[PDB]
Write a protein that binds this ligand. Structure first.
Ligand SMILES: O=c1[nH]c(NC[C@H](O)[C@H](O)[C@H](O)CO)c(CCCCCP(=O)(O)O)c(=O)[nH]1
Ligand SMILES: O=c1[nH]c(NC[C@H](O)[C@H](O)[C@H](O)CO)c(CCCCCP(=O)(O)O)c(=O)[nH]1
Ligand SMILES: O=c1[nH]c(NC[C@H](O)[C@H](O)[C@H](O)CO)c(CCCCCP(=O)(O)O)c(=O)[nH]1
Ligand SMILES: O=c1[nH]c(NC[C@H](O)[C@H](O)[C@H](O)CO)c(CCCCCP(=O)(O)O)c(=O)[nH]1
Ligand SMILES: O=c1[nH]c(NC[C@H](O)[C@H](O)[C@H](O)CO)c(CCCCCP(=O)(O)O)c(=O)[nH]1
Ligand SMILES: O=c1[nH]c(NC[C@H](O)[C@H](O)[C@H](O)CO)c(CCCCCP(=O)(O)O)c(=O)[nH]1
Ligand SMILES: O=c1[nH]c(NC[C@H](O)[C@H](O)[C@H](O)CO)c(CCCCCP(=O)(O)O)c(=O)[nH]1
Lengths: 154, 154, 154, 154, 154, 154, 154
């Protein structure tokens, strides 16, 4: 059987992070986690490119530019959506996830999902460096694995 | 670390606004907010191109034409959807959001979302220049930031 | 500020109407409304091309052919979906709306939405020339505006 | 006014049917209905190409191959989805309907929807040759009409 | 009609920020927002003077010193009050707001209110960079506008 | 950015404490806390001036005299108000807090708030050296910080 | 400030794993996770020493022997305790945790805790490679970090 997998040492890997500003008190923790995951897995912080955008809505178009860079091995999308009184959350969450996934397939490059899509503030806090971990760390770790995998698969 | 971000001074930026007429008593307030945001951030009103369409349904096709203009730095989509008795709201809201996001990725240009998708009239009024702010102002401000960001990112 | 808008006089405009036969007792009223709107706004009935198809499912593929005609300025999609006992309604309504919107963006031509998506028969009757107006008339009026707009925007 | 429509005599028409095997005790009735509809409307059974696949999930990829045949005038998609305990039904139903609709627009050829998407076994039986008719017959009849229409429209 | 208003570009403006330490985990987010608002609107971080004090109670006396500086164009008061079991919250909230407003009128200089006065922890988190935005950003933006306005009004 | 802050070593600082006698069994604990805080932070007890007055009502007029002393760096107001059966508590609490805050702004000198304003006896005990700490210690610590801050700010 | 931390690359590190057999269907998944974590972080599987014991009760005495090996950098304790009808769970859980912690302090070597202590079977399954992750992976990852840290700290 042929087996392909990615290891988790990030030496020489170069990452793009696209992080929105809406709910920044939480997003900022996700960004801390993603960078820490990269660095302590052997990646250099100098090999990270961070792009900030207003909201989750704007993440895909920026990610599309980062993912097209030949010297970016994977992109990590970071944002925090918390449902309000209207259906607005649904439409933004739907479009951010679809855009990112579509870009990954079109550009044949990993784009990992570190966007929290929570019903409540409490759920968002839980997933941004408290009791349920840090979604930025998770998405960074995934990006490390996928970039490594792609060294032999792509 | 490389860091890219957009500032919020709008000097020299050129914007497209696509605004629907359904629910115009509210849309009109969103349009006032978007223009004011642009102007008081240093953008010239002369550098704004405003396109009117019948409903949110028609916003994407018009935005597609504006976004293709080489001298438009970003497009701001403005509309007001308020749920009625049928599922019709769902299908229009889904298509307007998908079209705009798809156009942004295909044309590699920011298109911001200033379309209210409310369950009730009250929710719509709240978001059109009353207690929950002005969604047109928010989407304009996002467009200013994204246009600036794109000056170095794109 | 540059301002683009469509007027509502239909002189010289040429329209495609795609109308399904499922629920024809109601669709037929929508078709009457769309034609009347066009004619009494100055459009010639001879400049209308009417295409009939079995159900809403089939509307997109036919509209795709009409919208590709160089001598059609806009297409008006007309149909009546009424929810039954199963989720079938959801999947047809989703695909008809997505197809029409996608075609409009791909062909860069207005395609307006005059498809009723009702939960009940009563809701459908209300929107087909009774208490809530005539969705065909509404979609025709939108098509007139968009075709006019596109004379300067496209 | 120019009027295009398809008649229902199937003489000389050639059809592709893609039929899944999941829930075959019902699918098989849909297949009987579709063939009967074609034959008794004047089509030759020899002009029917039947493709079998495992489940509704696999219907689109096979239909995509049939629809690309120059000597197939329309494709009829036949399957039976019945909701179980999980959301799995939703994702398969969503993808089968979207794939078929997308293929029809991309290949500019009619692909009709004879896939039952039922909440219960009873609903499925009702629509597979019992009290609510036969969805295969319905989709075949639609295909006849669309193929005829396309002789002048396409 | 004579019309006076402030624009939102902060070039050359100099701001005083007085920030308390009680509830610092939240205040610190407010401070981040206020600085970011200033900087990305064109203000220089070097033109910001930040004064820290123990609690909201102490904000006025420090703001009084900052507002008296000839080279400070506006002061931004930042703090977080969260109601406890006693009426203590009421008396501190009343005195901080009255002191700041009184100082502004006496010194004829803008002092903006970025003090959260919440009944619950949750409300405070909402307003400190999560779902209800960032009160520091809001008060900074107000200070930019008022300083600009005062260039012609004062 | 210019940053001003006060450290917490109290060497050379001179404090005024104004302490009321109503509820003295609790006030006395607040006074013990304030003195201890000052001394163990390096302040000399000889540099403390303690003024006693009958009730919280009388605290402001005495504090006004202490705050005017050139050799007093900050004043600490200490008292215990516990609500009784009438609104009397409200009027005394309102006037003590307003007087102290007003004096601080008028004399441009820190006056910290160590007056408990409790609804119940239990709440008062909690805040006077039991489970919720010692409000005198808190107000003393604030005074240390403010006096230090004022060495560079004033 | 001096800062010590461990990175997460496991190159050259040597680990002891002590895994009990009670509830092995779950323990076995924890063991898979711990090994995978080690290997894909750069550790060699050959550098892992696995010791099996009957139950969680016996884990400490075996870990005590592994931790005393000069060529073991850290020990990972793996087990699954699920509460039954009696207090027995409490006493075993108390002694396993105390023994491991005591051994770590006495031998001045990291011993990480990958023992599930669940009230229900469901909770145990959740934490053994399903919805709440894999406690073996978590404890392995901790051991990598601690072993690295101890290269400079110990
Ligand atoms: O990342 C985000 N963004 C966001 N809205 C802003 C949006 O992403 C765009 O920036 C904006 O629409 C302009 O394009 C929000 C708010 C979504 C919830 C709206 C609450 P409501 O339904 O009560 O109006 C979020 O939680 N996370
Ligand atoms: O921007 C819009 N548009 C709109 N409908 C018009 C639509 O966008 C098109 O213009 C029309 O369908 C013609 O294409 C509506 C109404 C949607 C709710 C319908 C109520 P109902 O479900 O009770 O029929 C809106 O709220 N905001
Ligand atoms: O325009 C339409 N079409 C339609 N079904 C036919 C469909 O559009 C296709 O023609 C058919 O599937 C063949 O392709 C229907 C019926 C949809 C509701 C089905 C009820 P059920 O869920 O009880 O089975 C409609 O209301 N409006
Ligand atoms: O045509 C189909 N297919 C199908 N599942 C099989 C699927 O289509 C694929 O063949 C399979 O997933 C392999 O690709 C099913 C079962 C769907 C409902 C699943 C029940 P559950 O949610 O209880 O698991 C169906 O009803 N009709
Ligand atoms: O900015 C602040 N300050 C503050 N108290 C400290 C106060 O501002 C002074 O620093 C102190 O009184 C010394 O002067 C608090 C606590 C207020 C609520 C008290 C709870 P309680 O009523 O249960 O005692 C706050 O939330 N935010
Ligand atoms: O510091 C104080 N002072 C005080 N009352 C005395 C007041 O401050 C003056 O000393 C007095 O009014 C004379 O000027 C009180 C009592 C206030 C509550 C009154 C209870 P009642 O409403 O039941 O009459 C206190 O709790 N703490
Ligand atoms: O790792 C373990 N071990 C274990 N019991 C065995 C024990 O660890 C020793 O091996 C045994 O006592 C012999 O020393 C158990 C069972 C504990 C719950 C007992 C159920 P009861 O209270 O219903 O009797 C476990 O869940 N996980």
């Amino acid at each position: 059987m042929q087996i392909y997998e990615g290891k988790l040492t990030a030496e020489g890997l170069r990452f793009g992070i696209v992080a929105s500003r809406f709910n920044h008190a939480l997003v900022d923790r996700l960004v801390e986690g993603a960078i820490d995951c990269i660095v302590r897995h052997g990646g250099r912080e100098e090999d990270i490119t961070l792009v900030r955008v207003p909201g989750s809505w704007e993440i895909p178009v920026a990610a599309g530019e980062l993912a097209r860079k030949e010297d970016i091995d994977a992109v990590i999308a970071i944002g925090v959506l918390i449902r309000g009184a209207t259906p607005h959350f649904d439409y933004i969450a739907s479009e951010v996830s679809k855009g990112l996934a579509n870009l990954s397939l079109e550009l044949r490059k990993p784009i990992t999902f570190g966007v929290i899509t929570a019903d409540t503030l409490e759920q968002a806090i839980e997933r941004a460096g408290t009791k349920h971990g840090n979604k930025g760390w998770e998405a960074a770790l995934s990006a490390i694995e996928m970039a490594n995998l792609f060294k032999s698969l792509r």
